Amino acid sequence: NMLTKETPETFYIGKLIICNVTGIAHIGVKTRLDNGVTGFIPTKFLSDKVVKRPEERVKVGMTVHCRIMKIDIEKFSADLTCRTSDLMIAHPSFHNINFKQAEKMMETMDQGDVIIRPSSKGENHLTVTWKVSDGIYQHVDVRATLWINSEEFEDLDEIVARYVQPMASFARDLLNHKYYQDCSGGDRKKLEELLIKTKKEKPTFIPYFICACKELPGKFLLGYQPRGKPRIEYVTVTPEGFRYRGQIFPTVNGLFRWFKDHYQDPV
Amino acid sequence: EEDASQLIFPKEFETAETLLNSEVHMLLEHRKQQNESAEDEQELSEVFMKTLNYTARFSRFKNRETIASVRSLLLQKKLHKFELACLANLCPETAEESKALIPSLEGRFEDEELQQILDDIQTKRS
Amino acid sequence: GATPAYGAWSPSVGSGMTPGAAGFSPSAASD
Amino acid sequence: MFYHISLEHEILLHPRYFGPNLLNTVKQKLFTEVEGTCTGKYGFVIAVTTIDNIGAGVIQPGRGFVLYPVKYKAIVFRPFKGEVVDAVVTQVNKVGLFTEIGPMSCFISRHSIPSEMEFDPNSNPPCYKTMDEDIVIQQDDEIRLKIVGTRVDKNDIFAIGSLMDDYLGLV
Amino acid sequence: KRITTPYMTKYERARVLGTRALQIAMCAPVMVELEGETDPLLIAMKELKARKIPIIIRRYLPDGSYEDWGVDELIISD
């Protein structure tokens, strides 16, 4: 206490004391501490007695933090632990990850699960990714400009149950449609060639089909052949309903019942 | 040159509106309410804290209606706006006290009318 | 830049001129 | 005494802050700039209460900063000489009494103090009782004063109080 | 009731492009898709063609009045 100025009553067990190992006598690391206490780490601090020294557990030449378990600054010893453990149906999902690598973990999810992730700009941005269709995903780049408040970021449970859960419930109904098709995710080249082949078997009855677009997620596609010319009408799925010709339908069925008595105009 | 003793003030503040203790108390508390909600925010400065805890000691009353009441009962008379707050915070118990503290009240009004304005302020005090 | 605004897009309606007759399928109920 | 005024200010915004956060960022900058500060012109501006408008941001030629003039309402505190205010005694010493007034403080020598209010340095609490020990004025005693002189010291104010006027004590 | 020419003069085009390219060089958010270029003047020119430059042009008349013209409102010439 008169020369080194550090007694055992200051250093306690449980608190982390940074022990700088500068050398080793014969398997240990005997160095000095911050208060001049000669920190001699035993072989139990490195976990090796007949092998090389604790180079992975104690930094040779530098200071290595360890949990203080012995107060012997007057005895020329320092029981500093070299180990880091000695110092101490619509499922939600959480993250922090890369867009490419994120694509591989949302293919194992089935319809309905929503992952939360950051976004490529790497700060402030975040994105709500959900199962628009088989092989099609939405990436709501919230500031897809979905303007929100600042208070909601502390509770991440309502932005899904108010904007995406009803959206997914609305999107699932079209998947269970009687006339749904993949067409390679709505390839614009594959869709025009199907309507011209289905019209020839039954020229009187004109069928209709729905598809999602991989080229622009959240666009559904509704093609109909009033005559010998393919025609494509787009529709956006909204958190509150559907955006069809700028008219908002509360329920999934009123869209179809509005279409059955609107597609018979000459346009 | 400027001297509140003779109601002479800089034009930029003569055009400015004086505030009561309980008034600024309510405004500051409202701010603090907004300034401690809306997460991801910066704490108020110590200036705001010391101004709050100052005026909190000298709140004669609190509800906006009490402020509006004392303001309306004062403005109906012919007092200058500078007299509005010094006379509304202190609440001198007698007209003689108000006229001794405020030299502008001396001869400004009959003692019984100034005393009535005081007594009204006293009755507004919680 | 793998993810711009997708729902902020403007769905352009396609105009046409088909002076056809009325021989199409009837409507249904909403339940 | 407290006040509020429509102030105006102008901020130079760096181009990094353009895009969707722009006007919100201008607001945040103004709250960063002019809150909690005192001025030789207007005295102690306590805070902006509201923004009257954000002007059209002129792009500075040859440097990308855009200059936004902004007009805004702010609460402000500007004491004047002659004003008789409520205050709280903070420190009682034989050198003089020290007292706080909103953001500011005042100081009151024994010279300003009536002769009967002798020093009490020998009691634990510093006081200025009278000789019969009836009117006990001590620290933290909500004592009135009259601002007899103003002084601004580098964006701060430091008045001087007095006790010469009658009825300057306990209510 | 804007009475000035509805065309972007070549002076307004030079200044708008240089100013916007400066803003881009100072890391301003771009208003147009970058197909993979990096010169701020090339970006500013693309934005000009996309009419997405977030700049309005205050044209002073000789009486000292002024008119404000977006950079999407008036007809870009070249």
Curated annotation (Swiss-Prot), chain A:
Tissue and organ distribution: Ubiquitously expressed.
Domain SH2: start-end pairs: 89-179
Locations listed in the record: Nucleus
Domain S1 motif: 27-83
Residues with PTM Phosphotyrosine: 263
Subunit structure and binding partners: Interacts with RNA polymerase II and the DRB sensitivity-inducing factor complex (DSIF complex), which is composed of SUPT5H and SUPT4H1. Interacts with KDM6A. Interacts (via SH2 domain) with SETD1A. Interacts (via SH2 domain) with POLR2A phosphorylated at 'Ser-2'. Interacts with IWS1, AICDA and PAAF1. Interacts with histone H2B and H3. Interacts with WDR43. (Microbial infection) Interacts with human cytomegalovirus/HHV-5 protein UL69.
Family: Belongs to the SPT6 family.
Its biological purpose: Histone H3-H4 chaperone that plays a key role in the regulation of transcription elongation and mRNA processing. Enhances the transcription elongation by RNA polymerase II (RNAPII) and is also required for the efficient activation of transcriptional elongation by the HIV-1 nuclear transcriptional activator, Tat. Besides chaperoning histones in transcription, acts to transport and splice mRNA by forming a complex with IWS1 and the C-terminal domain (CTD) of the RNAPII subunit RPB1 (POLR2A).
Protein name, as recorded: Transcription elongation factor SPT6
Gene from which the chain derives: SUPT6H
Residues of the full protein shown: 1151 to 1519 of 1726
